[PDB]
Symmetry: C4
Subunit: 387 residues, 4 copies
Amino acid sequence: AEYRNWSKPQCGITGFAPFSKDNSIRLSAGGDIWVTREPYVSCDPDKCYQFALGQGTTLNNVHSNNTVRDRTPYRTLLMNELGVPFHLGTKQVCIAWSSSSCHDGKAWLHVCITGDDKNATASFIYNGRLIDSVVSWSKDILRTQESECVCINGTCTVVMTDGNATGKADTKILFIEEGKIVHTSKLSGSAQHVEECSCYPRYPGVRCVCRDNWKGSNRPIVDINIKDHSIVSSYVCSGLVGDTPRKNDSSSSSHCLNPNNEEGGHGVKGWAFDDGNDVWMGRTINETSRLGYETFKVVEGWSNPKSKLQINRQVIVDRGDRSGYSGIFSVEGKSCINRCFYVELIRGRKEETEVLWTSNSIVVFCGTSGTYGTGSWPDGADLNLMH
Amino acid sequence: AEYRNWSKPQCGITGFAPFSKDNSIRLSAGGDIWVTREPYVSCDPDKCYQFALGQGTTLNNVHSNNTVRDRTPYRTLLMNELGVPFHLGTKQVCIAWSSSSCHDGKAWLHVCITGDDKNATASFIYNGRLIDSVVSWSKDILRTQESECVCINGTCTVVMTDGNATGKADTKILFIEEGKIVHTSKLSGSAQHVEECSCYPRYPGVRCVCRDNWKGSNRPIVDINIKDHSIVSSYVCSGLVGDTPRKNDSSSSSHCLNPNNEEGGHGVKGWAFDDGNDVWMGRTINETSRLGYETFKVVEGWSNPKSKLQINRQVIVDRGDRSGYSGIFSVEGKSCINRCFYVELIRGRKEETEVLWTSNSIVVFCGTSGTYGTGSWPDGADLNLMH
Amino acid sequence: AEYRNWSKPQCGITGFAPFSKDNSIRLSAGGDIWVTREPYVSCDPDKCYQFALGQGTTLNNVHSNNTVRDRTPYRTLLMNELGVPFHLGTKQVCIAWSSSSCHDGKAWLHVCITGDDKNATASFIYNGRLIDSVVSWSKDILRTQESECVCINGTCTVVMTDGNATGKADTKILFIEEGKIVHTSKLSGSAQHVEECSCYPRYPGVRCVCRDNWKGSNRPIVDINIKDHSIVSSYVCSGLVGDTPRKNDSSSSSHCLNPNNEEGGHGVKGWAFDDGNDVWMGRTINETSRLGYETFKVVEGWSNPKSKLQINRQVIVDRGDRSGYSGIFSVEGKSCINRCFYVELIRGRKEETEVLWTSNSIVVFCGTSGTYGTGSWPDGADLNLMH
Amino acid sequence: AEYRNWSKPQCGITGFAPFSKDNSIRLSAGGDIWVTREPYVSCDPDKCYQFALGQGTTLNNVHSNNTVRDRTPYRTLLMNELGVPFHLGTKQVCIAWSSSSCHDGKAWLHVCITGDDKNATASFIYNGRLIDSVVSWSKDILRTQESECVCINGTCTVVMTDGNATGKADTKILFIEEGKIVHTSKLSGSAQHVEECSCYPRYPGVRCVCRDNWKGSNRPIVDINIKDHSIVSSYVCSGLVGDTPRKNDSSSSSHCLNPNNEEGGHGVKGWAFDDGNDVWMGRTINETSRLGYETFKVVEGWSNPKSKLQINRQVIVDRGDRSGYSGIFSVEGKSCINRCFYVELIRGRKEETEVLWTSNSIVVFCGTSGTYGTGSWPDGADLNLMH
Ligand SMILES: *[C@@H]1O[C@H](CO)[C@@H](O[C@@H]2O[C@H](CO)[C@@H](O[C@@H]3O[C@H](CO[C@H]4O[C@H](CO[C@H]5O[C@H](CO)[C@@H](O)[C@H](O)[C@@H]5O)[C@@H](O)[C@H](O[C@H]5O[C@H](CO)[C@@H](O)[C@H](O)[C@@H]5O)[C@@H]4O)[C@@H](O)[C@H](O[C@H]4O[C@H](CO)[C@@H](O)[C@H](O)[C@@H]4O[C@H]4O[C@H](CO)[C@@H](O)[C@H](O)[C@@H]4O[C@H]4O[C@H](CO)[C@@H](O)[C@H](O)[C@@H]4O)[C@@H]3O)[C@H](O)[C@H]2NC(C)=O)[C@H](O)[C@H]1NC(C)=O
Ligand SMILES: *[C@@H]1O[C@H](CO)[C@@H](O[C@@H]2O[C@H](CO)[C@@H](O[C@@H]3O[C@H](CO[C@H]4O[C@H](CO[C@H]5O[C@H](CO)[C@@H](O)[C@H](O)[C@@H]5O)[C@@H](O)[C@H](O[C@H]5O[C@H](CO)[C@@H](O)[C@H](O)[C@@H]5O)[C@@H]4O)[C@@H](O)[C@H](O[C@H]4O[C@H](CO)[C@@H](O)[C@H](O)[C@@H]4O[C@H]4O[C@H](CO)[C@@H](O)[C@H](O)[C@@H]4O[C@H]4O[C@H](CO)[C@@H](O)[C@H](O)[C@@H]4O)[C@@H]3O)[C@H](O)[C@H]2NC(C)=O)[C@H](O)[C@H]1NC(C)=O
Ligand SMILES: *[C@@H]1O[C@H](CO)[C@@H](O[C@@H]2O[C@H](CO)[C@@H](O[C@@H]3O[C@H](CO[C@H]4O[C@H](CO[C@H]5O[C@H](CO)[C@@H](O)[C@H](O)[C@@H]5O)[C@@H](O)[C@H](O[C@H]5O[C@H](CO)[C@@H](O)[C@H](O)[C@@H]5O)[C@@H]4O)[C@@H](O)[C@H](O[C@H]4O[C@H](CO)[C@@H](O)[C@H](O)[C@@H]4O[C@H]4O[C@H](CO)[C@@H](O)[C@H](O)[C@@H]4O[C@H]4O[C@H](CO)[C@@H](O)[C@H](O)[C@@H]4O)[C@@H]3O)[C@H](O)[C@H]2NC(C)=O)[C@H](O)[C@H]1NC(C)=O
Ligand SMILES: *[C@@H]1O[C@H](CO)[C@@H](O[C@@H]2O[C@H](CO)[C@@H](O)[C@H](O)[C@H]2NC(C)=O)[C@H](O)[C@H]1NC(C)=O
Ligand SMILES: *[C@@H]1O[C@H](CO)[C@@H](O[C@@H]2O[C@H](CO)[C@@H](O)[C@H](O)[C@H]2NC(C)=O)[C@H](O)[C@H]1NC(C)=O
Ligand SMILES: *[C@@H]1O[C@H](CO)[C@@H](O[C@@H]2O[C@H](CO)[C@@H](O)[C@H](O)[C@H]2NC(C)=O)[C@H](O)[C@H]1NC(C)=O
Ligand SMILES: *[C@@H]1O[C@H](CO)[C@@H](O[C@@H]2O[C@H](CO)[C@@H](O)[C@H](O)[C@H]2NC(C)=O)[C@H](O)[C@H]1NC(C)=O
Ligand SMILES: *[C@@H]1O[C@H](CO)[C@@H](O[C@@H]2O[C@H](CO)[C@@H](O)[C@H](O)[C@H]2NC(C)=O)[C@H](O)[C@H]1NC(C)=O
Ligand SMILES: *[C@@H]1O[C@H](CO)[C@@H](O[C@@H]2O[C@H](CO)[C@@H](O)[C@H](O)[C@H]2NC(C)=O)[C@H](O)[C@H]1NC(C)=O
Ligand SMILES: [Ca+2]
Ligand SMILES: [Ca+2]
Ligand SMILES: [Ca+2]
Ligand SMILES: [Ca+2]
């Protein structure tokens, strides 16, 4: 077995085709299913896997009460093959209320953060063995991507943040080899606040589209040179911005090198990627809450901050149904690298009070060069009947 | 590992021997079992697998209400080893309310159709990665075989239909190589309406026996030349016809090249195959509803439209118990290709109103050259006790 | 991989050491567990597997009512690794209300009998594919060993019976190669009635100790020459007889070549094997019902019909707890062949009326050349609490 | 595959990082989970596994009543991959109310003790086959380590004890090769009473830190020469003693070669290991009951009986939550041997009377040479809600 290099061109993409759906919440009304949140997908050279942060409990279970909370000692990283719902046979690969995983061609790396908010620990687990660990450096919720990291040759990059979420924080890029931290780079550039990055290989390096909880609804970009460990950062230029909350499509604006100072203070994990000067992106349909999910291409949106020209829109989750985090993963093919994405479908507290729990299911789409129709693939659970 | 060619003679067949039974519904009264329909079987070079379209729910579950419906966003293709019932550990391999799967000797191909009725998407997934996709062409429920496809050398064929079910529709044969659609052929011949084909390798090509919802109770045949992509079609000549509804065995008639215009408008998935001039077939026992299942050979039934001479009848499901879809799969042996079949055993709405759900179990028989007795292997669940 | 020959000497045996216990019934009071009976054990070159005839239902399930019945269309052969209880993920390898399985070094063979009592079908499944089948020859419950068969070189033997149980029947020995019946030998010798044989390799051939429902409480022996397919039969000489019902140890008698005409009409599956002129055997402790299980060696018991000299007695199940069928399996070691056995622990109807079901758990002991203590390992479920 | 030698240096350790947590009890309030106690961890060259002594029942199950008892015929050794909770699919690898397991690089060895208290049997199972067994020698609860054994070259050592727990007993060290007992050494040295040893490879030999139920709260040490089978024993010198009950840190004393005669009569399984003249150890936080768990290094604590200078303290379980047994396991790396430990988190009777059962979950930490923060990772189940 060989290290991955991702040294192939991105595949031609006219849009996205359905790929997987787990129906986790619907099953949990008649079965023993983990309570989860912050899920993601990542693939080794053979199969794809779905991950999520468990809440140390099943859904039909007294311990699912108050699982809206984000950090407990009971949260672990769950790992299953894509399409296998999180049942009692699921392997808990580490302790974590924030995590990232990736496969370098030979083995899995998991970055797992747990412990106290003001003094958390990141554990680096490679090939099933703990290789390294680092303590929180700003003493304020050390946290990482909640989606897959990227390994090129033998070196994996992962973006971690520590500090005030709605303000100035310390973001670092770690370079990890067989689980060992071999270098640490500070975030550099014009992206001020960066969190929950959705990274993807863009040979010779790594590109990430992130979440800005501070001063903007246009997403930060972080480019990682995996050889000299240099970092450049900016924002997705597209005048159609990708975060939530945001202004409506008439009033919204963006900049290539600065936050847009529109609907700052909040945000959501999301993704985008470049196709020449165009950008492919997803986002919630509703501008203020996490309802619906839509995907489209913005013509010149990767370079033109005034471009509002979208095309190839697809509705993934219709506007009336709940969405959540979303993120990108990459799949190596015969001759090109495809881009896929997952959407977290959050149900429960606080927005829905019929139940006491908070959990999610997922839906997964993959890039295609063929043709496709329309549809909507929501969570589909009836919370009024789950009593 | 090598591509399959199926370049062996069909095995001598005196009838069929019991092979597998899952008891899915009986278990679901005391366990967490998927609600399913439209199941089928297919084998890689080593093991056999059972597939079905899940309904995104278990049986003992509030979400099993109204699962008589055929297309929802929650339906996925379930895949287990043959004999393993669909429990919560079952892998959902794709999103689908219509599907087909086959193994070419190296990896699995899944054809998965989901989305809106008037604008559905077929996803082509090979070796766990999405390779291609195509949109509905007639904007009227793009749909496929609900049983295994067939791969010869590296090329898999699958029959898809789009358009009016009880009338004129557009049926195409797709040629797929490592998940990529390499050619598309239009249905040609005297079979007017063709749906839910049961295909089997008949080297050098592929043969299918299908369902005619339009003008006939004799089953359409489709012959696929896998090299030049040419298509010839006709009907099973046998005066004992294989569809449901149908006329009684005295009044029924058939033609080799035309629908019999008897009990048109309805139908059911089924199968048949040729043994020289004879045809081996199965069908429901009751002429008007899906009750019972019987298998027999019609002497000269593959070529004589007037032949009503059956022999080697076996009762698979006695006349008083519910059956459903059935289909063929092929198993490569040491020196010959065997033919096997599955029978869907449907329970629930609308015909049985004691419950609110609709699901099935299955029973599987394989061709034999030995001897066999008699029996009946129904679903066996007591719906009156499942409250 | 190579065919097994079992061409090693039997290991030195001073008794038996605990090996595995599944606690199936205790678990079923708080989990989804198959209802089973007639279990057995068999090992491929790497691991050991436990088999049983399922009743097409779990225990906590309305369909477990009246599972005292022996033959239904819903019974299947369950197969798990030894120590894994029969949960919903268990593979049902075939349809069967009577079965036998063995591994020849390359793949598994399963002999599976199902269908009507007066017209049953034996299915021969090798390496996951149906290879052969045979119909009942006496039209009276074709039935087989309910324990492992034995393969030497490439040839597996299995003993099947058809006809009146409490009288004259037709017993045949089948020789099976890669699932194909290559020869059939009629039972020959002085063993008149032979059923539910417990066979074990005794190179160059196969030896079986069986159950006589007709005229005796001393167990029949069947020796199978695997090359010329010749059969010799007799009885276990030991004056301490191995069947149930039987006379007390003072009044019991035996013969090497004839049934003892004591407590004829009934019986139970069991086992014994030779150690020079000595016999190692197990049997129920109670003489009339299936209570307790004990193992011992009878000095000269393999050749002396008057020998009542036992030694190395071990209690496996104390006299007050329920036992059932038991049987032998063989495990190839570095330089010798060990002998092990399982005991079925039956609970439920008809003897226990607190519940409506009938099922079993198992306990497994293996031959040892070391030392051992005492104990008792019953089923341990409290049926009064399972309501 | 090759035998393990553990011929690498111990890894540099600044403390311990979180590694795994199973949340077994929280899940059992909404799922079918084994009742267990006395768990441990052990790793083959590829993955780590979690073991425990099952009680032959699940938690939500009438048979979990009175599972505070230590020895029943229903207790079996459960084995799962680390992180997979003990669900109904868990393999019961042997019968045991006391056990030890280890992997020599080629296969697993399990030492399994069951049977009567005054006449128990140890079964030695290697590569899935029973190879040897030995009877109790002092006729008073033959018992072993309840954590992993250690194999160097092809030879595994395991420490077993038989006799009065709160007094003089007979402790032997067994040397096992491919499951066969090849030598037996009597405990020799100044450690009088030795039980439940936590052993770890310290090339060229094996070192164990044990529990003294007799005359001391300082832990016995046993050094095993794996070539000449010689045994030296002593006590952990550290003036901060590792057992429970114990005196407070001001009043406690220790000796290198004698029990401290403080809080004799009781004790708990635990661990420690040497780092030059320093000792790394864990222990309960509360001096008298099994509440809390803390880890630290005692400067010169491996050689100085008066040293009370601790540093690098970490709280594993805060002082108000229940702990239990703990033990060490070793993980071979690229160039060094790491040391990890597990902590049993006991819930239920007798200390907690809201429920009738007694069970545990676990938490696992691994040695690290990086940095870490703080936290507390208790069991987290709410027993008041589990009714
Ligand atoms: C079955 O499924 C398939 C696959 O899913 C479906 O096909 C997909 O359908 C969707 C939905 O329509 C399409 O996405 C939309 O695309 C258009 C852009 O494409 C159109 O316009 C292009 C540019 O045209 C202009 O220039 C050309 C010269 O270059 C000139 O000729 C022309 O007259 C015009 O001036 C055309 O190139 C393009 O034609 C091509 O494609 C056609 C297929 O669509 C085909 O017929 C042609 O042959 C040719 O190949 C095409 O006409 C986007 O406009 C659109 O996004 C708007 O609409 C969505 C709702 O769909 C809405 O959510 C968005 O916000 C956005 O709406 C804003 O913009 C509109 C235009 O500015 C405006 O009308 C709206 O009111 C709204 O304005 C608001 O926002 C803007 C900023 O965005 C702001 O400034 C305003 O103030 C205000 O706030 C979608 O992205 C897919 O491309 C299409 N996919 C494929 C592969 O074909 C199919 O529908 C399904 N079939 C059935 C039966 O269900
Ligand atoms: C911890 O666990 C271990 C391992 O499990 C336990 O050790 C095991 O213990 C069991 C139970 O005792 C033993 O099995 C029994 O074995 C004896 C046979 O062995 C004894 O007798 C041998 C022959 O002695 C005669 O000849 C010699 C000369 O050859 C002469 O010296 C002697 O005086 C006598 O004349 C001896 O060789 C043998 O000694 C050897 O072993 C000893 C250990 O046991 C050891 O001390 C010696 O050093 C030496 O090595 C030994 O004394 C069987 O008799 C016995 O079976 C009877 O008892 C069981 C109940 O245990 C009962 O169910 C059976 O039915 C049977 O009882 C019938 O026969 C008896 C004798 O005829 C009679 O007294 C009974 O009333 C009864 O009679 C009825 O049946 C007969 C037909 O059977 C009928 O004709 C009558 O009319 C009537 O109906 C057991 O098989 C194991 O061998 C032993 N295992 C080992 C490895 O040591 C240990 O007990 C446990 N420890 C603790 C503390 O729990
Ligand atoms: C985020 O997480 C990280 C990682 O977990 C946290 O960092 C860890 O924090 C813990 C908790 O403090 C530390 O463990 C404690 O370590 C100290 C020993 O280290 C201190 O003392 C050393 C010796 O100092 C002496 O000598 C030097 C010269 O050699 C001289 O300069 C000095 O003045 C003094 O005389 C120092 O080397 C050491 O400094 C080093 O480390 C510092 C970081 O801590 C750093 O600032 C320095 O730069 C330098 O590198 C340091 O000052 C142990 O004393 C302590 O154990 C005591 O406390 C725990 C509670 O924490 C208690 O449970 C123990 O029982 C014990 O308390 C007894 O002893 C005390 C001293 O004797 C006494 O005050 C207590 O009352 C008590 O006495 C009782 O017991 C004794 C016997 O034990 C008995 O005789 C008495 O009668 C009585 O019964 C802990 O082990 C970790 O080392 C530290 N880890 C790391 C990697 O840094 C961090 O806190 C977290 N951050 C946040 C914001 O949460
Ligand atoms: C996190 O950072 C934000 C900066 O965005 C801080 O909020 C600012 O606080 C000052 C002083 O109270 C106000 O004048 C500003 O209006 C706030 N800014 C915004 C954008 O609302 C916040 O206090 C920081 N948190 C901590 C704990 O330091
Ligand atoms: C689907 O096709 C059928 C043809 O079989 C159409 O039904 C026919 O409709 C015409 C006009 O209403 C009637 O005169 C015929 O008697 C019908 N034929 C039969 C066999 O019943 C049907 O309308 C078509 N559906 C659509 C949506 O076009
Ligand atoms: C085929 O099945 C149908 C039911 O689908 C049977 O028709 C029923 O017959 C009984 C007795 O004649 C009537 O009371 C019912 O009203 C009928 N049911 C329905 C739904 O129409 C029919 O008898 C079966 N045919 C054969 C040959 O067995
Ligand atoms: C099965 O065989 C037994 C022979 O063991 C038959 O039972 C005998 O029947 C005759 C005639 O009724 C009686 O005189 C004998 O006493 C019976 N023998 C015994 C040992 O009880 C039995 O009838 C046979 N069953 C069938 C269906 O033929
Ligand atoms: C187990 O050993 C202990 C020795 O520690 C025995 O307890 C002692 O018994 C004597 C006589 O009754 C007392 O004088 C001592 O005070 C006891 N010692 C302690 C430390 O409490 C105990 O009896 C032994 N058990 C058996 C069954 O022999
Ligand atoms: C160690 O744990 C024990 C309990 O095992 C604690 O003792 C309890 O203390 C409270 C408050 O002092 C008393 O009300 C209880 O009666 C005690 N319980 C028992 C069972 O004795 C003790 O406080 C703990 N010690 C430390 C240092 O935390
Ligand atoms: Ca934002
Ligand atoms: Ca029809
Ligand atoms: Ca008998
Ligand atoms: Ca002690």
